[PDB]
Design a protein around this ligand. Structure first.
Ligand SMILES: Nc1ncnc2c1ncn2[C@@H]1O[C@H](COP(=O)(O)OP(=O)(O)OP(=O)(O)O)[C@@H](O)[C@H]1O
Lengths: 741, 212, 295
């Protein structure tokens, strides 16, 4: 009653700013959304919180303890007007105040849709922001009417509030406070509004300060907040592990087994304590942060939860799955008021990161460790899939155990858009909860529901919290090497494996906004929108750019991905995807990857393990490098497109193509001549001048401009620099694989 | 009772052969059949697995008592020299091979050579058209020695067929010289020759019986 | 007691799965080889009563390249021992290399605790090959090799007596891990005279901020006090047994022990655990005795 309506007050506290832009009303942002919400709905408790907030006082229609005073303290945490006349900017750039200062960028309040084109920030849009936009308030109309505000319908509002309002600014004031989006400002302040009410309730304190809390300086200095975070280990080892070649079909179903496990942590822990989805701050891949309160009852909740969450993960699994929590109390004065040094802002994360490295090397303890070293199994036939003997059953030809039993059925179930979380039917992901798909026919639904691609044209009676994960697939896994041939005959039965991993993310994340001594650049909302804007490109925008091409994304996230398929376009798509990230960040965050080619029908245990060593071996130079086949072609990543792919690849597709077939063997002597280079340097130059001049007279002499452009470029690209010879050697090798078989 | 019988010999290649490996590996281009070599130095080394599957195959057709349908099951008089997964009287065999390396580089560089391997051009006729699929392969050089190690040990308990096993190993190494070794040896690429076939005992428990 | 020096090249040392392989090897891999050759030679009733003599112990895999190498301490440095992270950009670029570190040099065992972060020397590159099986059509496996170069050796420290010198001398003509049927596991036994005068802090008595290695397993009795205020790292090692009477090849029970270089605070005991699935005429026993270092 008094708590359910409190969650809605922290979300629509600035809803009148959007209507003020369209409808010409000059009054106050806190009064437009108050009268507009009362026309559609019919509530009295929420009508008092939205009414007065700032520069209103209003000591009427209130007693002594009313839920309308804690909305001002939580609102100042996310931050750092009356009549409107002009607009300074329209959604300031987040990457602009990160790192150096380059060209100005301006976003555009469009519609977040998978089929719609992304709105890149540039100087083309009008920075004045004319007060109009007849499409920003047209969608929000029929979806708001007829909606019961209770406990069962409290999480469905967050799935729509960030569906089109993700490109809407919040409180445009100068430059320091302008890049904070409205979808992230109202979402982050919802967690602080509940922590204040829970802090005074557990300690036995009421709202005695009537009309504006006069003790604002003393409340910010007292530590009344808790920062919790987990670190799920066992992702790149349990998924990338197999012993048979015929088990390549369940590769996609195996990667999705741990994807929904991290989403379940942000559901059972937030509901058992007594909160909602306001603590969701980038959940996915075993890396998420949760803000709470420095009380006494909420501390015992995470201690008991971690002791039972790892209990059922011991009999079915072994020891590769473990979740290590990490709490860290802090104060509200570290992100506002004084303390301009970056040490005050980084101290919050250091209090919850030192124990993570200690708890992972101290998992099990007494008695619990004796469960694995018991000794009672007398089996002799293993599964040869996950190296575990538990509930053996014959389905294909070997003996399928219990862990990999549901992976074969779930492989043909990912195509279902809607999912149903059961109890004892499906893949076990929690204590007493499972997960399975459905063909749009809810016949049970006991717990919750998690779907995907739920943004536009999907807001009926679904009731499901959508996540961020890929779904675009092709057909099987062990068949991309055969479908990599057109009609004339090119390419062979090979494939490439690339692991894109963006850099400059783990470092310079908390103190990367410092550029001026005036602003503190330590607002929590500034870092929330920084990781959320990049999380949209490495997951949602990947499926949009996957059109007109056969691929299959595996493990989607904002850190490291996994792509596989025909190598006829992955090489060209890997460098093309990086070009879209540089323009999005205005050339401030680098990117790295690792294209690796292997054979056909190879075990994933070693195929996906050898392709990851190329990224570690490329770190010898600095931070921007990539390797191709072996560990010798370690360039500068970006140099591959500015030299090799620039003129060494475009100006060769139609020069030597006319000399193919009848003269295809003439290129084999060129890639082999550059092999013996460490022997003699004087002999390697004189020998090259003999086999190159023979390709001018033997060919057709009718066209003078056929070999003249190729002879001049081949001589300069080889005799100019020692490190430059590797560019011409790799360019000539990629052309041989282009036309083959 | 227990000793290690080492048959130190020198494998002299009288004819250049070819051994296939992984596609687009130990080289730079996936063409002309890349020959497997050494990951450290550019020395065309021969793996020890090629001598295990070839010597046992040619042995199961001159001294056998059962139709060889699958390995580790063909007869039993010769399965004790390599291994057997079905029989429980013995786990593995009594012969251990080793990846022989090219030790002829001490005098090959004095002659002045370019590379250790060459590219050979071959083709075929479809019996209805002219040249069909002008392919190409990669062969090695001849007159090259290799350090082959043949370790033999007895299990003490079954010390009664020692003289019977000596005539089998000597016949297996001599029969290999009259047949191709490696791959694609039907046209005349294999045919090795175990030069300087001598035996020695590096332990001190079993005296030397024979030499050749 | 002395020590043995041996090197490996073009060998194979798997870990967890047959197709996968690593660089070093566990401590129980050496002990399982001397017992197999004891029954074949003719002294099975003499080697079993020698390993359980307390003073007789073995070590794990330690690289040897112009000097002995020692693993890095797990947990060091702590939050107060390490320097204050003033600039997060210059700390995260060097702190990740210490986590992926393999082994430390013999001259850096005293300066690493005061502040030293560098990249470990590359031992060897991981090389793999491929094979098949004709006259079957339906078999394609992948194996890897451990071709060491740049003078890479793996020494071992044991108790030299008048019987151990005749047992491990014949092991160089056999195999140790990996594809033993092909010839992966041969080494070269090299003996010297006076051992190293620096790595002589091995004892089993006091416990003053020591560190146990060899991936040993604590005793089932004392464990509440030894594990308290300590660190460890669970691994994975299993596989079938070695027998000649059973025709089923039963799977042995897993023994998730610790890792090398784990710091503790109490002297362990080191017992012998019995692992028997169903029934076997022999006896499968585990060794791995802990060895403390004064640091
Ligand atoms: N969006 C995000 N929000 C919060 N934390 C994140 C986010 N993305 C990544 N991280 C954190 O970053 C860590 C991974 O760091 P990473 O390995 O990318 O560093 P790195 O780029 O290798 O560093 P360097 O470039 O110095 O080598 C994870 O532990 C995760 O907790």
């Amino acid at each position: 009653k008094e708590k359910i309506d409190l969650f809605y007050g922290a979300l629509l506290h600035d809803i009148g700013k959007v209507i003020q832009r369209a409808t010409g009303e000059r009054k106050k942002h806190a009064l437009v959304g108050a009268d507009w919400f009362d026309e559609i709905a019919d509530n009295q408790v929420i009508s008092d919180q939205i009414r007065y907030h700032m520069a209103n006082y209003q000591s009427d229609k209130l007693g002594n303890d009313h839920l309308a005073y804690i909305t001002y303290i939580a609102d100042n945490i996310a931050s750092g007007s009356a009549k409107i006349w002009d607009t300074y900017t329209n959604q300031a750039d987040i990457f602009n105040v990160f790192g150096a200062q380059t060209d100005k960028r301006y976003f555009k309040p469009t519609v977040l849709n998978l089929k719609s084109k992304p709105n890149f920030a540039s100087a083309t849009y009008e920075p004045f922001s004319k007060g109009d936009y007849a499409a920003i308030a047209t969608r929000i109309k029929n979806e708001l009417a007829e909606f019961e505000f209770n406990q069962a319908q409290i999480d469905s509002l967050l799935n729509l509030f960030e569906a089109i309002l993700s490109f809407v600014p919040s409180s445009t004031n100068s430059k320091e406070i302008a890049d904070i989006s409205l979808a992230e400002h109202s979402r982050l302040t919802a967690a602080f509004a509940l922590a204040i009410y829970d802090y005074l309730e557990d300690k036995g304190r009421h709202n005695y300060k009537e009309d504006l809390f006069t003790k604002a300086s003393a409340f910010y200095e007292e530590e009344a907040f808790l920062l919790a975070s987990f670190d799920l280990s066992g992702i790149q080892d349990f998924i990338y592990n197999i012993a048979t070649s015929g088990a390549a079909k369940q590769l996609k179903a195996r990667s999705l087994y741990l994807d929904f496990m991290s989403e379940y942590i942000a559901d059972s822990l937030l509901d058992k304590l007594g909160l909602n989805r306001a603590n969701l701050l980038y959940v996915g891949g075993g890396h998420a942060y949760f803000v709470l309160a420095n009380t006494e009852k909420t501390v015992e909740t995470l201690v008991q939860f971690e002791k039972d969450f790892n209990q059922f993960l011991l009999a079915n699994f072994q020891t590769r799955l473990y979740v290590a929590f990490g709490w860290g109390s802090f104060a509200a004065k570290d992100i506002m008021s004084e303390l301009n040094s970056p040490e005050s802002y980084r101290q919050i994360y250091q209090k919850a990161s030192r124990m993570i490295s200690e708890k992972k090397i101290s998992r099990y303890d007494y008695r619990t460790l004796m469960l694995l070293n018991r000794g009672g199994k007398s089996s002799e036939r293993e599964c040869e899939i996950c190296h575990s003997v538990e509930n053996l059953v014959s389905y294909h030809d070997q003996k399928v155990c219990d862990i990999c039993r549901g992976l074969y059925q779930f492989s043909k179930e990912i195509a279902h858009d809607h999912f149903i979380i059961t109890e004892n039917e499906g893949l076990p992901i929690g204590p007493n909860a499972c997960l399975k798909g459905v063909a749009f026919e809810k016949l049970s639904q006991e717990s919750f529901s998690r779907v995907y691609v739920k943004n536009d044209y999907k807001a009926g009676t679904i009731k499901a919290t959508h996540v961020f994960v890929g779904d675009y697939q092709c057909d099987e896994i062990h068949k991309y090497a055969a479908l990599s041939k057109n009609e004339d005959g090119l390419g062979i039965k090979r494939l490439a494996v690339v692991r894109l991993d963006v850099d400059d993310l783990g470092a310079a994340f908390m103190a990367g906004f410092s550029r001026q001594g005036n602003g503190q650049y330590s607002t929590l909302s500034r870092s929330a929108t920084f990781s959320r804007s990049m999380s949209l490109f490495f997951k949602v925008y990947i499926n949009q750019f996957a059109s007109d091409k056969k691929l299959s994304i595996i493990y989607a996230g904002g850190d490291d991905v996994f792509a596989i398929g025909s190598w006829q376009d992955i090489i060209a798509f890997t460098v093309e995807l990086r070009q879209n990230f540089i323009k999005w960040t205005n050339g401030k965050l680098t990117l790295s990857a690792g294209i690796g080619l292997f054979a056909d029908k190879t075990p994933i245990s070693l195929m996906a393990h050898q392709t990851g060593e190329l990224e570690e071996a490329a770190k010898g130079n600095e931070k921007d490098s990539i390797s191709l086949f072996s560990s010798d072609y370690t360039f500068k990543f970006d140099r591959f497109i500015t030299n090799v792919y620039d003129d060494k690849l475009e100006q060769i597709r139609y020069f030597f193509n006319h000399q193919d077939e009848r003269g295809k063997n003439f290129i084999y002597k060129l890639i082999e001549l550059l092999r013996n280079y460490e022997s003699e340097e004087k002999m390697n130059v004189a020998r090259l001048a003999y086999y190159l001049t023979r390709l001018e007279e033997l060919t057709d002499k009718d066209e003078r401009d056929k070999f003249k452009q190729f002879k001049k470029l081949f001589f300069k690209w080889y005799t100019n620099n020692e490190s430059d010879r590797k560019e011409a050697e790799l360019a000539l090798l990629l052309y041989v694989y282009e036309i083959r078989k | 009772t227990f000793a290690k019988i080492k048959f130190s010999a020198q494998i002299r290649l009288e004819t250049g052969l070819h051994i296939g490996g992984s596609d687009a590996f130990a080289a730079i281009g996936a063409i002309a059949s890349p020959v497997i070599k050494d990951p450290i130095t550019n020395i065309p080394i021969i793996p020890g697995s090629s001598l295990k599957g070839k010597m046992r195959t040619l042995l199961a057709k001159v001294y056998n008592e059962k139709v060889a349908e699958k390995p580790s099951d063909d007869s039993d008089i010769l399965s004790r020299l390599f291994g057997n997964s079905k029989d429980k009287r013995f786990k593995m065999g009594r012969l251990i091979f080793r990846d022989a390396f090219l030790s002829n580089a001490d005098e090959l560089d004095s002659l002045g050579v370019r590379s250790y391997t060459e590219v050979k051009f071959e083709n075929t006729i479809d019996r209805i058209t002219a040249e069909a699929n002008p392919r190409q392969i990669e062969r090695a050089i001849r007159n090259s020695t290799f350090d082959f190690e043949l370790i033999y040990e007895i299990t003490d308990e079954n010390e009664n067929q020692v003289e019977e096993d000596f005539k089998v190993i000597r016949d297996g190494l001599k029969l290999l010289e009259l047949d191709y070794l490696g791959g694609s040896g039907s046209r005349g690429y294999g045919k090795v020759a175990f030069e300087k076939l001598k035996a020695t005992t590096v332990f001190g428990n079993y005296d030397v019986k024979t030499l050749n | 007691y002395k020590l043995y020096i041996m090197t490996f090249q073009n060998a194979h040392f798997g870990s967890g799965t047959l197709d996968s392989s690593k660089l070093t090897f566990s401590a129980d891999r050496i002990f399982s080889a001397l017992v197999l050759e004891s029954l074949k030679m003719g002294k099975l009733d003499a080697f079993l009563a020698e390993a359980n003599q307390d003073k007789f112990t073995l070590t794990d895999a330690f690289p040897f390249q112009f000097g002995p190498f020692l693993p890095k301490p797990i947990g060091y440095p702590k939050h107060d021992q390490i320097d204050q992270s003033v600039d997060v950009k210059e700390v995260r670029r060097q702190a990740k290399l210490s986590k992926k570190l393999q082994f430390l040099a013999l001259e850096n065992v005293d300066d690493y605790l005061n502040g030293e972060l560098f990249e470990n020397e590359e031992h060897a590159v991981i090389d793999t090959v491929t094979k098949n099986q004709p006259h079957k059509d339906g078999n394609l496996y992948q194996v890897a090799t451990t071709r060491f170069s740049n003078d890479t050796s793996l020494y071992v420290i044991a108790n030299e007596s008048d019987l151990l010198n005749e047992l491990m001398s014949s092991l160089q003509y056999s195999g140790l891990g990996g594809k033993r049927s092909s010839g992966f596991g041969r080494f070269e036994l090299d003996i010297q005279n006076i051992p190293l005068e620096l790595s002589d802090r091995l004892t089993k008595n006091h416990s003053d901020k020591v560190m146990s290695l060899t991936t040993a397993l604590p005793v089932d009795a004392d464990l509440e006090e030894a594990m308290e205020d300590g660190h460890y790292l669970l691994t994975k090692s299993s596989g079938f047994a070695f027998s000649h009477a059973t025709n089923e090849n039963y799977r042995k029970q897993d023994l998730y022990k610790f890792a090398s270089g784990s710091t503790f605070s109490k002297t362990f005991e080191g017992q012998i655990v019995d692992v028997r699935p169903l029934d076997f005429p022999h006896a499968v026993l585990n060794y791995a005795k802990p060895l403390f270092f004064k640091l």
